[PDB]
């Protein structure tokens, strides 16, 4: 009759607990669809709290009821068959709930991952386009400004590799998600990934086209500066020659021939500078440079000035003979 | 000199990332285990976040720098040999940081479970000792008060069921940790476990001793009560028989014989009550009740009074019916 009370008490506890499990099953059984990334995020985080609260509270109560029932069954209570029936029904209900919590937790993780893909694709896409937009058209005005622009571009191309990394990550996510799904869905992931890859492709193509144009414009201004330096120098040598005073005695002839021969040494020492300059110019022509017409003009001006200079040197020498 | 710019640019990114990795490694390399349960709980959560952030931020940066280094090597940069040296060492530093994060996660997890065992053992030992301090000693002085105390002891016994489940959980935790470690640490755990189990046992034995002494005490009062009810009744039946007037004519004799047979009817109606009472008394004696001497005296007073009542009823009936 103590065993009578113990039995009546256990019945109460089992009924209380199964009622509590049924309450939790309503929540765990929710089929609520996430409307967008923000909402699925909320859903997942709420249910993670719920799963943990449910497990914490329920496991202890289930263990207590199981203990009470096992004590009565093990002691050979005359209602052992009924008591075992109670215990089985409870353990089944609890196992079913935990299974359902598992299934919903999975479904919400899958959904989260899928919404996150579309989210990251929107964000990478926007970052790509925003970067594409900050990309100068101009090549620049002289040697000094072109080399600054070249260095800025080198930094820009540096400063997009981080987006590249994010693009490759998106590609891996798309791959993982496409294995999960099929039909309409795996298709839409492919399209979305493609939109981002094409935007990326276009940014790189534009960075490469700009790198190349800056090299071309740089080479142009390099060539022009080589020509200018030679032209200025040649005019100096010509003026040097023009400044020479006709000798009035043998010691003056000797001095002037020595000085003039010094000038030939100056001239000859520039041979490699002419070669470097002319080779570059001829290179640019071979590659159909946009400034080919200027470049021929400058090559012709250089060779006409060089002839002026050599003619003037030879005329002076041969009259000093 | 383009190629030089890219080299120095990479150089900076490499040294920067390595700095950043060194900073994360200081955090991952902490040897702080937590001063108590609360502390290690917090340590553990905060590094959980740290490990996630570090891995996510870190991996992208490493991968970014590898790509840039690989671009330079693949295009035959003059310093490809040196670049590959920077790259290789960065990757080693990153992989080292990742293993170190796994290591810290593991020993935080281990510290957490050890702290928690000692936190639970102290909580439970304290709860058991507190419950045991609140166990009453009084058994009651009458049937009603025993009944009340029994209700209250039932509640007490109910109150400690969840406490039992916590003790059993601690035993589970104790065996798992004892299997996990060994030497003086495992010994320390078994020591703490046995302390709780002994207090638990002490409480359970006390609750059961009380439960039983309350049943015994209540049964004694209930038996004494049953005997008293029968004694008072019997003495009144004897008084009713003794009050009867000697009949003086045939009609009176017939009326009295009827009324007398009515009295037997009333007497015989108590057969179940006597049986219940006597069986209770006998049940206490086989129990070896501590009041056995007084229970025996009462059984005898009861049966002797019933024999007296019956004898007086029968002697009256005999004299009447002749
Ligand atoms: Mg039921
Ligand atoms: Mg259901
Ligand atoms: Mg919204
Ligand atoms: Mg049945
Ligand atoms: Mg059921
Ligand atoms: Mg002139
Ligand atoms: Mg934890
Ligand atoms: Mg070396
Ligand atoms: Mg009281
Ligand atoms: Mg368990
Ligand atoms: Mg009674
Ligand atoms: Mg008659
Ligand atoms: Mg009558």
From Swiss-Prot, chain A:
Tissue: Isoform 2 is present in brain, lung and kidney (at protein level).
Interval of the full protein contained in this chain: 1697 to 2014 of 2364
Superkingdom of the organism of origin: Eukaryota
Quaternary assembly: Interacts with CAMSAP1. Interacts with ANK2. Interacts with CPNE4 (via VWFA domain). Like erythrocyte spectrin, the spectrin-like proteins are capable to form dimers which can further associate to tetramers. Can form heterodimers with SPTAN1. Isoform Short cannot bind to the axonal protein fodaxin.
Associated disease: Developmental delay, impaired speech, and behavioral abnormalities: An autosomal dominant disorder characterized by developmental delay with speech impairment, mild to severe intellectual disability, and behavioral abnormalities including autistic features. Additional variable manifestations may include dysmorphic facial features, seizures, hypotonia, motor abnormalities, and hearing loss.
Family: Belongs to the spectrin family.
The protein's role, per its UniProt record: Fodrin, which seems to be involved in secretion, interacts with calmodulin in a calcium-dependent manner and is thus candidate for the calcium-dependent movement of the cytoskeleton at the membrane. Plays a critical role in central nervous system development and function.
Residues with PTM Phosphotyrosine: 112
Subcellular location per the Swiss-Prot or TrEMBL entry: Cytoplasm, Cytoskeleton; Cytoplasm, Myofibril, Sarcomere, M line; Cytoplasm, Cytosol; Cell membrane
Name of the protein: Spectrin beta chain, non-erythrocytic 1
Spectrin repeats: 5-108, 112-214, 221-321
Species name: Homo sapiens (Human)
Modified residues (N6-acetyllysine): 122, 220, 296
């Amino acid at each position: 009759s103590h065993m009578r009370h113990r039995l009546f008490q256990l019945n109460r506890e089992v009924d209380d607990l199964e009622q509590w499990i049924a309450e939790r099953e309503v929540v765990a059984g929710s089929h609520e669809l996430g409307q967008d990334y923000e909402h699925v995020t909320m859903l997942q985080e709420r249910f993670r709290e719920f799963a943990r609260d449910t497990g914490n509270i329920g496991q202890e109560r289930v263990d207590t009821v199981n203990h009470l029932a096992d004590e009565l069954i093990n002691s050979g209570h005359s209602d052992a068959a009924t008591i075992a029936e109670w215990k089985d029904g409870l353990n089944e209900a609890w196992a079913d709930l935990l299974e359902l919590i598992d299934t919903r937790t999975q479904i919400l993780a899958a959904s989260y991952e899928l919404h996150k893909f579309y989210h990251d694709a929107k964000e990478i896409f926007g970052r790509i386009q925003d970067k594409h937009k900050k990309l100068p058209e101009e090549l620049g005005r002289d040697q000094n400004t072109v080399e600054t622009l070249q260095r800025m571009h080198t930094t820009f191309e540096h400063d997009i590799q981080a987006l590249g990394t994010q693009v490759r990550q998106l590609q891996e996510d798309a791959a993982r998600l496409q294995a999960a799904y099929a039909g309409d869905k795996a298709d839409d992931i492919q399209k979305r990934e493609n939109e981002v890859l094409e935007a990326w492709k276009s940014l790189l193509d534009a960075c490469e086209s700009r790198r190349v144009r800056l090299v071309d414009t740089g080479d142009k201004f390099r060539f022009f500066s080589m020509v200018r330096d030679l032209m200025l120098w040649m005019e100096d040598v010509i003026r040097q020659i023009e400044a020479q005073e006709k000798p009035r005695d043998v010691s003056s002839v000797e001095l002037l021939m020595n000085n003039h021969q010094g000038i030939k040494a100056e001239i000859d020492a520039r041979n490699d500078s002419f070669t470097t300059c002319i080779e570059l110019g001829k290179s640019l022509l071979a590659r159909k440079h946009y400034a080919s017409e200027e470049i021929k003009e400058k090559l012709l001006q250089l060779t006409e000035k060089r002839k002026e200079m050599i003619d003037k040197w030879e005329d002076r020498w041969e009259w000093l003979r």
